[PDB]
Enzyme design. Structure first.
Site, PDB file in Angstrom:
ATOM      1  N   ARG A 189      -8.619  21.407   5.854  1.00 37.67           N
ATOM      2  CA  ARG A 189      -7.376  21.941   6.424  1.00 37.67           C
ATOM      3  C   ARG A 189      -7.536  23.353   7.039  1.00 37.67           C
ATOM      4  O   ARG A 189      -8.543  24.018   6.794  1.00 37.67           O
ATOM      5  CB  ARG A 189      -6.222  21.901   5.392  1.00 37.67           C
ATOM      6  CG  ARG A 189      -5.777  20.496   4.942  1.00 37.67           C
ATOM      7  CD  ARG A 189      -5.190  19.662   6.075  1.00 37.67           C
ATOM      8  NE  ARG A 189      -4.492  18.463   5.605  1.00 37.67           N
ATOM      9  CZ  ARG A 189      -3.947  17.551   6.407  1.00 37.67           C
ATOM     10  NH1 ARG A 189      -4.024  17.684   7.725  1.00 37.67           N
ATOM     11  NH2 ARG A 189      -3.322  16.499   5.896  1.00 37.67           N
ATOM     12  N   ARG A 205       0.826  -1.200   0.000  1.00 38.13           N
ATOM     13  CA  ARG A 205       0.000   0.000   0.000  1.00 38.13           C
ATOM     14  C   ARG A 205       0.859   1.249   0.000  1.00 38.13           C
ATOM     15  O   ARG A 205       1.817   1.349   0.757  1.00 38.13           O
ATOM     16  CB  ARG A 205      -1.033  -0.012   1.133  1.00 38.13           C
ATOM     17  CG  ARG A 205      -1.760   1.318   1.360  1.00 38.13           C
ATOM     18  CD  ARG A 205      -2.521   1.269   2.671  1.00 38.13           C
ATOM     19  NE  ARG A 205      -3.257   2.513   2.948  1.00 38.13           N
ATOM     20  CZ  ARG A 205      -2.935   3.390   3.898  1.00 38.13           C
ATOM     21  NH1 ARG A 205      -1.887   3.178   4.680  1.00 38.13           N
ATOM     22  NH2 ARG A 205      -3.663   4.483   4.074  1.00 38.13           N
TER      23      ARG A 205
END
Ligand SMILES: O=P(O)(O)OC[C@H]1O[C@](O)(COP(=O)(O)O)[C@@H](O)[C@@H]1O
Ligand SMILES: O=P(O)(O)OC[C@H]1O[C@](O)(COP(=O)(O)O)[C@@H](O)[C@@H]1O
Ligand SMILES: O=P(O)(O)OC[C@H]1O[C@](O)(COP(=O)(O)O)[C@@H](O)[C@@H]1O
Ligand SMILES: O=P(O)(O)OC[C@H]1O[C@](O)(COP(=O)(O)O)[C@@H](O)[C@@H]1O
Ligand SMILES: [Mg+2]
Ligand SMILES: [Mg+2]
Lengths: 274, 107, 518, 514, 518
Positions: D107, D60
């Site tokens: 964010r 991954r």
């Protein structure tokens, strides 16, 4: 019966208290069992016969050995063209119990309505076969059947599983001795088991087993063994189409072996009807 | 709707019974073998042809009564009736012959 | 090694079957209700005494035949026989009376002016059906009169007509204004005043005829316990019977007889409107193909068990016992399978009304029921009944399933239930315990109506109401202990389940006690 | 005495539990797929060689961080390590490459980092940027434009992987007036969660687009798509991958309440599911995560679609060479739940013991696989699976049944696309499924499914098709013998088809090992 | 859409899993007992008040560390915190005290004279183990002293030595007398007085050491409720603890800690001899391979459930909560699965003894337990428990199962049980009802010891003994009604199950009542 009659099936008739008590040893030594309710119902109290019937059918189903339910199933049909309600019930319950065969005695031997008696057994059996709770029956047969290394037993359980999953119109089994078809019958599929054989005795003896619809192949041996196998499969397709068991496009299960001779059934195919 | 498929899908035996339906027709196939005792009502070739058509799979001969000559004739008739259908291998039904012994008795 | 307890412990139904043992004897208790049709073989006080001793719980009166005077006398004789045992309250057995209506029946008339004359019908022969009243008493091989004036409106060319329990079959080949030209398919002997079935046809006859009205009113007058309503096709048929019974007969149980295709198709609405169901296999097996009757029987028993409503299996259960002292193997099987299916009650008709062996028939039903009750796979049955029964706030329902659970856990000899209306005992019965349910009541109707439910062994307490309620409750519990000891259901030291309520009155059952037999 | 066969024969689940035996050793075969996040602890060719040896099936790549150059190099290293074993085709293990998207992140602001947070206080949240350069417990700005349309007064807000809690007291407009519920270390440009809210950020961000295109260029096997909320999200990823990436498997990550609620439509649109417990355990109460995990595993097992259990499975192994007892339990229970794969994140990306973490997953999985109550599992899967006319479905269930009946050492399946092997896996046999394929991507993608042990056949195509089929069966026999799955004389189940090409598997044979 | 009732109704375990729903909120009642280790983070009266409010049921005292004086003060503080709620008997929560013995532990010496001093050990480096007490205080990077005299006679060359919950591993390279030479395989931060494991070795240390004797004696003096006996290997070990406790401690519960191979192997005999079991995963996961622990945990929980004996799941359940206010996903999973497995109790060790977030750890165990309790597949669980539990004549068993059955049928808010010894309440807990079991007792020790059983919510009745026994019984039932109402387990009009007996004294529970909440 000796060497000359070694292939003749011995069905032990259980007729008395001793036969019931020593049932397991009798079953192991026999090819199958008849629940001979006539004598049994004189030998033991009449009200206990259903206990011995359901015990023997159960144990035979467990052993994978043919069981016959016999005697007075449609008794009133000796004199009358319709059965009583108890008789219709009795036939249906013998099938629901799990009997491979049902029997007629005086109804066909001496009665006034032999064909009506036969027809009635046919109509009831088929209604009762649809009323079987296969979901529980197949779960219980699997759970109670020994794990073995026998490839045929594993193939035959695979075939029945597959037949339930695709709702197949039949299970086609090539068989010389009947054994591979018997092994399928033990697991009680809903679909008929078309047993294709060149052995005329095999074809006749297969009627001892629930769901085995034997077909005697007369066609000559094709040159390539694989082609002779496919010929017999196609023969069973033709029988099934003609009998209305299935039509072109339907799926069937097909059982064959990897080489000629008895004892090599190890191949299961899910195939469309051509 | 056919062959009690609604009853087939039930999660309990009790619900399975509840779903049994007189309007759900069976399939064509019949799985249970039919054994018929042959005697004077059913012995002729012509009656035996109809017995087979009606669904007889096994012909039972009861050896409590009758001579070997009588039984040999019955068996001959069973075979005559059975083989009359051999002309179409697709439709031919095999028919077994069963011998039912007298066994130990009292008379 | 008793009561199929080895089979009881099996993990699968298949193994359960494998374990059924002809050498494992049943308990003394018999749970299945026995309904007997009373007629000339069984009508005397003296015969009725033996019926009761042999296990008869309900006396069925068939209103197809006989006058009110005849029926009143039968009812009187039933009550005389029943009350001859009232002297010992411990041994006294309550006996219910059931009225079975004629309903929309179709019958032929008299063969050549006689009730007993017969003619033969040959396969292929023409038989003419007439509604001309001239031929009422003049039926024969060539001309048959029957009592349904609208037959020609509802039959067509190619229709089948069944005469005499569907033994004789006719095919309508030619239809006239007020007559039918038929061909004998299935021939045989045709006698007088035989039942006629029109399986194809939408029969136009009333649910409750004027005769049915008078009969139902007579039932109210005679204080009958229950009505077996013939030929119920729909819920509105049940409501008609219910309206006829009225406020005065509001406590009389209505059992709808399912005996046609319509009754099967509309089963759910009929069940909801009824107090219970009879699987009336006689007519049903003529109306629908004979090979389908087991389907309808198992469907109706199952749905009734699920609803907790009484279900009777009826007709030809031991038919050959009309003429013979022993049943056929199919008959032995049929009785056992009705029990195993879940039926609350099994029935005798001709076997007790007119046969040569009424007491043997009764005895045989008793023997088989009790053998079959031990062969029930209770482990699956109780699991499935629980899973399918609604969760409710009803304290009595909770007490009842808890009592049944408890009875399985300690292998109790009985569940003792004090009940005024029967409801608390009915609620126990719904969960199918192995042990008998001794229902203690002071209500004589409650005691009689309790025979409709599997396992309920009603006992009529005739001790006067003791002043301290707790003492009156203990008196009735002790009465049940005495009954159970006398009938051999249990002995001193055995454990039983006891169900009572927290105050007198009805609707307060909430107490379950595990008690030793004193 | 082996493989929990005594527990296997129990009539009840309770008795099955009673019979679990620490002295009953597992078989060699391990069925659960192991997915390893690659990072600085695990990125070198040499470490990756050991990763593979230790049981890593899937590499991954987390696209939250790192450049395409960095990722290209990791992928190159994975391939270098994998192909070093290609010399022996009998022993070679295929290794898949998974791209895990960044997805729609929210964010904050900047620090010229860990500041003090006033447990109680208030923080002014606007979209114009006012206290941009400094992040102090007073004023903070956001990147999420549609904040006020998805959050109401009395909707909570998480900061820095759920560390800082905040409850909304006023709208909005652009402004947000708050109370502080948790005290912690306030960062800079940090992660924001909106629990309960149906967030209307693009499924596929501009960055996700470039990443997904890079994945196609780099021939990745599968995409782990972040923050999947609905079926249209999956369709967007699928469209972005396009014709060129039509064979790349899309695994939808279930990360929030919307994904759980819209689970059925997501599952239908996806190739598989990841139970993304990290984000999920922030968005929904932590004590509910096991419910969503067992719900999703169950539904995936029912659908026959791969399910990955992910996040913190062996978390303490980042710092310690042995896991905690909760971690050993978690891995075993994910396997018992029915998970096709288990995953490692920080344990392999950044930890001190990546190979020990991999090894531990392999040991636990194999112990847990023997502890499965197959008797109930197979009964339930078969009762719940639709009756269909599909010949391969019928063959596969038939094969699984026969594998139980003869206690086979393996189910050998010839497969082009993997589908025939996937169909066997759905019925959860005890025996390994040796999937013989010439398709290298098929061999890599097969790791998504429980029990499928893929083998890449390199042998050239024989002119007689029957001989080419037998060659591939024999290849699997050789692999199974070499790996100690079975020996000569043992019986195995063999699945083939009636003609070449995908979609024709209809033949089940019970065959002795030569 | 509450208590996973949709999942509850599923016909298969797989469908049950498919129906688990994050939007289906749990009830109020939490059934799983919470055991908290008390230490510096948690021993203030004020913190202990909050632990009780947060759901702490049992206070575990770990006798590996600390003096009798220190432990006496902790116990005093537990009692002070508990009794601060005595003012309202309706809201008072009984709190048990558990003594967890040191047992046959092996511990290292002090690092460089100090108990908090830490060397970082190097991977591959050499370390010398000595039994020479010269070094017992002088433990460093190349010299480690152990307290196990017989070390050398039981550990061969090549043997694995584990230090500090198995985190540091050493291989027996050089085998001598009085000492060993090893290489650090797993290096790390070595501290002082750390646990040592010899998984290969047959460790010959006594079951009950001289320290254990002083400790158990102290437990008797301090009126502890239960002993968690470390490192139980065999039934004779349990008998030893039992004889040590003697007549004076005959009512103290012995919980055998299973933490090595031999104790798993000899599990059945240990279980039979003990009052319950702790799955002591810490040592167990070092003694046997880590990957086998779940097998031994599920085996032991299953066998305990089958025996109806309490089982504790212990060690590292929320380990990361020592340093963090939220658990890892593995830890949430572990808690939920221990409950789903069928553990009566879950435990906290360092999370409550020394961690930064003891109250958060307690709260989290409470939230997860209650979520997992709703996710139990009771349909299968209750069916299996019934099928596997012996049929007996015991009236109390029959009543207890009747009760649980009834509680499922009416979805009762509680099962109220009057109990003197706890046994009647224990018998209900064995069959795993969904509803809480409110156990009403006057026995304060019974009230405390009842926390060992899943679902038992003990209430200590303080009300004086009424002259009429029936009134005294009703008073205690009403007390439980008041508790349930106050705790929001149920409201007026809801139904509850009530268990009582026919006469005073232990062993007569035979009465089950379905009662509305007044
Ligand atoms: O049921 P049996 O008697 O074992 O026969 C099954 C046999 O029939 C076959 O399918 C065909 O064999 P033949 O070609 O010799 O008839 C074999 O492969 C298989 O072993
Ligand atoms: O089944 P029913 O009709 O509700 O009657 C049960 C009733 O019988 C009792 O046990 C006894 O009532 P009585 O004293 O009025 O006869 C009540 O406590 C209970 O409510
Ligand atoms: O799993 P898939 O992709 O359907 O592939 C299975 C196919 O593989 C085969 O066994 C062999 O096919 P090839 O010869 O094309 O490789 C086919 O008979 C079968 O249809
Ligand atoms: O659980 P135990 O110890 O057997 O106690 C239950 C006992 O409590 C009671 O309900 C009340 O007894 P007391 O009045 O003596 O407390 C008894 O009837 C019953 O036998
Ligand atoms: Mg009628
Ligand atoms: Mg320990």
């Amino acid at each position: 019966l000796g060497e000359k009659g070694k292939n003749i099936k011995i069905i032990s008739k259980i007729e008395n208290h001793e036969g019931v008590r020593r049932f397991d040893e009798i079953l192991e030594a026999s090819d199958g069992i008849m629940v001979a309710r006539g004598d049994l119902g004189i030998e033991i109290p009449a009200e206990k016969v259903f206990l011995a019937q359901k015990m023997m059918i159960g144990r035979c189903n467990r052993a994978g050995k043919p069981v016959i339910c016999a005697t007075q199933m449609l008794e009133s049909m000796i004199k009358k063209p319709r059965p009583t309600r108890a008789e219709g019930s009795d036939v249906a319950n013998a099938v629901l119990d799990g009997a491979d065969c049902i029997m007629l005695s005086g109804e066909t031997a001496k009665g006034d309505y032999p064909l009506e008696a036969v027809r009635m057994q046919h109509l009831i059996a088929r209604e009762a076969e649809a009323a079987i709770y296969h979901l529980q029956l197949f779960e219980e047969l699997r759970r109670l059947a020994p794990i073995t290394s026998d490839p045929t037993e594993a193939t035959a359980v695979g075939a029945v599983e597959a037949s339930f999953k695709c709702c197949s119109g039949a299970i086609i089994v090539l068989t010389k001795s009947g054994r591979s078809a018997h092994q399928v019958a033990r697991y009680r599929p809903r679909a008929p088991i078309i047993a294709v054989t060149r052995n005329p005795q095999t074809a006749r003896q297969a009627h001892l087993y629930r769901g085995i619809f034997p077909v005697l192949c007369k066609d000559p041996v094709q040159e390539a063994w694989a082609e002779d196998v496919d010929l017999r499969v196609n023969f069973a397709m033709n029988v099934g189409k003609a009998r209305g068991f299935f039509k072109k496009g339907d799926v069937v299960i097909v059982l064959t072996g990897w080489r000629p001779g008895s004892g090599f059934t190890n191949t299961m195919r899910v195939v469309p009807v051509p | 709707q056919t062959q009690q498929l609604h009853a087939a899908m039930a999660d309990t035996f009790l619900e399975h019974m509840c779903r049994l339906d007189i309007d759900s027709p069976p399939i064509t196939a019949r799985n249970t073998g039919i054994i018929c005792t042959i005697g004077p009502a059913s012995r002729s070739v012509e009656t035996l042809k109809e017995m087979i058509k009606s669904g007889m799979n096994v012909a039972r001969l009861n050896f409590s009564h009758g001579t070997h000559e009588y039984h040999a004739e019955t068996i001959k008739n069973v075979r005559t009736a059975t083989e009359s259908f051999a002309s179409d291998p697709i439709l031919y039904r095999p028919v077994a012959v069963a011998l039912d012994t007298k066994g130990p008795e009292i008379r | 090694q008793t009561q199929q307890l080895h089979a009881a412990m099996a993990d699968t139904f298949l193994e359960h079957m494998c374990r059924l043992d002809i050498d494992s004897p049943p308990i003394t208790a018999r749970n299945t209700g026995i309904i007997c049709t009373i007629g000339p073989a069984s009508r005397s006080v003296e015969t009725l005494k033996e019926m009761i001793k042999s296990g008869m719980n309900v006396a069925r009166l068939n209103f197809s035949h006989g006058t009110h005077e005849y029926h009143a006398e039968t009812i009187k004789n039933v009550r005389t026989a029943t009350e001859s045992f009232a002297s010992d309250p411990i041994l006294y057995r309550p006996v219910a009376v059931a009225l079975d209506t004629k309903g929309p029946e179709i019958r032929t008339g008299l063969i050549k002016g006689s009730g007993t004359a017969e003619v033969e019908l040959k396969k292929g022969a023409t038989l003419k059906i007439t509604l001309d009243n001239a031929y009422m008493e003049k039926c024969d091989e060539n001309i048959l009169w029957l009592d349904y004036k609208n037959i020609c409106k509802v039959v067509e060319v190619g229709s089948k007509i069944y005469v005499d329990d569907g033994l004789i079959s006719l095919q309508v080949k030619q239809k006239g204004a007020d007559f039918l030209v038929t061909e004998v398919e299935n021939g045989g002997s045709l006698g007088s005043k035989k039942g006629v079935n029109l399986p194809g046809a939408a029969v136009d006859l009333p649910a409750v005829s004027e005769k049915d009205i008078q009969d139902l009113k007579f039932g109210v007058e005679q204080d009958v316990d229950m009505v077996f309503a013939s030929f119920i096709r729909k819920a509105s048929d049940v409501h008609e019977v219910r309206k006829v019974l009225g406020e005065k007969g509001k406590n009389i149980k209505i059992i709808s007889k399912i005996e046609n295709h319509e009754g099967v198709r509309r089963f759910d609405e009929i069940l909801e409107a009824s107090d219970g169901i009879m699987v009336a296999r006689g007519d049903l097996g003529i109306e629908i193909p004979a090979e389908k009757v087991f389907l309808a029987q198992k469907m109706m028993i199952g749905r009734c068990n699920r609803a907790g409503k009484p279900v009777i299996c009826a007709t030809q259960m031991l038919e050959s016992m009309i003429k013979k002292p022993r049943p056929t193997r199919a008959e032995g099987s049929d009785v056992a399978n009705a029990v195993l299916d879940g039926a609350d009650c099994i029935m005798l008709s001709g076997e007790t009304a007119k046969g040569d062996y009424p007491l043997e028939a009764v005895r045989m039903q008793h023997l088989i029921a009790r053998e079959a009750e031990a062969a029930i796979y209770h482990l699956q049955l109780f699991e499935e009944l629980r899973r399918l029964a609604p969760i409710t706030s009803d304290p009595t329902e909770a007490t009842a399933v808890g009592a049944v659970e408890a009875s399985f856990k300690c292998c109790s000899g009985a569940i003792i239930v004090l009940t005024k209306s029967g409801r608390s005992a009915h609620q126990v019965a719904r969960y199918r315990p192995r042990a008998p349910i001794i229902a203690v009541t002071r209500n004589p109707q409650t005691a009689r109506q309790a025979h409709l439910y599997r396992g309920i062994f009603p006992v009529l307490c005739k001790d006067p109401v003791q002043e301290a309620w707790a003492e009156d409750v203990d008196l009735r519990v002790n009465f049940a202990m005495n009954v159970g000891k006398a009938r051999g259901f249990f002995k001193k030291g055995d454990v039983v389940i006891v169900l009572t309520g927290w105050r007198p009155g009805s609707g307060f059952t909430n107490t379950m006690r595990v008690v030793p037999v004193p």
